[PDB]
Design an enzyme around this catalytic site. Structure first.
Site, short mmCIF file in Angstrom:
data_model
loop_
_atom_site.label_atom_id
_atom_site.label_comp_id
_atom_site.label_asym_id
_atom_site.label_seq_id
_atom_site.Cartn_x
_atom_site.Cartn_y
_atom_site.Cartn_z
N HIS A 244 11.04 -11.18 -3.30
CA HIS A 244 10.27 -9.66 -2.51
C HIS A 244 9.54 -10.18 -1.53
O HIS A 244 8.73 -9.47 -0.93
CB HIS A 244 9.23 -9.61 -4.04
CG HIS A 244 8.41 -8.38 -4.00
ND1 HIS A 244 9.33 -7.18 -3.88
CD2 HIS A 244 7.39 -7.72 -4.16
CE1 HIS A 244 8.57 -6.15 -3.90
NE2 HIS A 244 7.55 -6.39 -4.11
N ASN B 266 1.69 -4.51 -3.68
CA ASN B 266 1.65 -2.86 -4.00
C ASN B 266 0.25 -2.66 -3.29
O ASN B 266 -0.09 -1.62 -3.54
CB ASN B 266 1.37 -2.94 -5.51
CG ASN B 266 2.45 -3.39 -6.30
OD1 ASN B 266 3.69 -3.81 -5.69
ND2 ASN B 266 2.72 -3.52 -7.69
N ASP C 261 12.43 -6.54 1.17
CA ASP C 261 13.43 -6.46 0.46
C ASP C 261 13.76 -5.32 -0.35
O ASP C 261 12.86 -4.48 -0.56
CB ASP C 261 12.82 -7.48 -0.86
CG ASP C 261 11.45 -7.10 -1.57
OD1 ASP C 261 10.62 -6.91 -0.76
OD2 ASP C 261 11.56 -6.36 -2.56
N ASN D 45 7.02 -0.75 -4.50
CA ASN D 45 5.67 -0.16 -4.61
C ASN D 45 4.71 -0.50 -3.46
O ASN D 45 3.89 0.38 -3.02
CB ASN D 45 5.03 -0.61 -5.75
CG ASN D 45 5.66 -0.06 -6.93
OD1 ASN D 45 5.92 1.10 -6.98
ND2 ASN D 45 5.76 -0.68 -8.11
#
Ligand code: NA
Length: 193
Positions: free
Chosen positions: A24, A72, A97, A118
């Site tokens: 991520h 996020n 990613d 997100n």
């Protein structure tokens, strides 16, 4: 009219050792690399909520950013910096990613959906709900998604990811030296033809 279509480049990620080298963070790896290659170290800048930097490529300023907001909450770093330098969402490129693309593949994209990242959701939201920023989609595969996205890639797979980072970087240089269209053409053919 627009001799520089991309003025900000962002790499999404999560900070701290409990997320270092996880899938991520792929976007960040691209920013790190591009900055390494132009001898710039990134500095934390509280007002922008992340690691920033100014790169001189083809004698143009390209600003870079890796938020420390947690993934996020990436939108707030991006907006703080873009509002400071009055940079339109359309002039921003966000590396991230991408689960929908395999390891070793990278693609550009403008506008559209977040595909469940997100980070993108919150970026869209914090840019006055404007989707039309550019994306650099770093492929990471599917498999458990929480575990995968926040996992480290096995070593054989990591070198697939690093190759894709390397290509993305080349195409960003090209975007800056030779234009957006030439970079878009090169990445579109990558692994495809
Ligand atoms: Na990392």
């Amino acid at each position: 009219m627009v001799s520089q279509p991309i003025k900000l480049l962002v790499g999404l990620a999560n900070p701290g050792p409990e997320y270092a080298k996880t899938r991520h963070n792929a976007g960040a790896w691209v920013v790190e690399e591009l900055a390494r290659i132009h001898n710039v170290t990134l500095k934390n800048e509280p007002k922008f909520f992340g690691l920033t930097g100014r790169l001189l490529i083809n004698s143009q300023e390209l600003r870079v950013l890796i938020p420390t907001t947690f993934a996020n909450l990436s939108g707030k770093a991006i907006a703080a910096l873009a509002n400071f330098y009055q940079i339109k969402p359309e002039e921003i490129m966000v590396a991230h990613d991408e689960l929908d693309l395999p390891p070793g593949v990278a693609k550009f994209k403008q506008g559209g959906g977040h595909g469940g990242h997100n980070g993108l959701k919150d970026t869209i939201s914090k840019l006055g709900n404007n989707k039309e920023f550019y994306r650099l989609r770093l492929g990471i595969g599917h498999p458990k998604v929480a575990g995968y996205v926040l996992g480290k890639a096995p070593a054989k797979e990591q070198e697939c990811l690093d190759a894709a980072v390397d290509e993305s970087v080349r195409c960003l240089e090209i975007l800056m030296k030779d234009g957006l269209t030439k970079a878009q053409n090169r990445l579109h053919t990558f692994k495809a033809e």
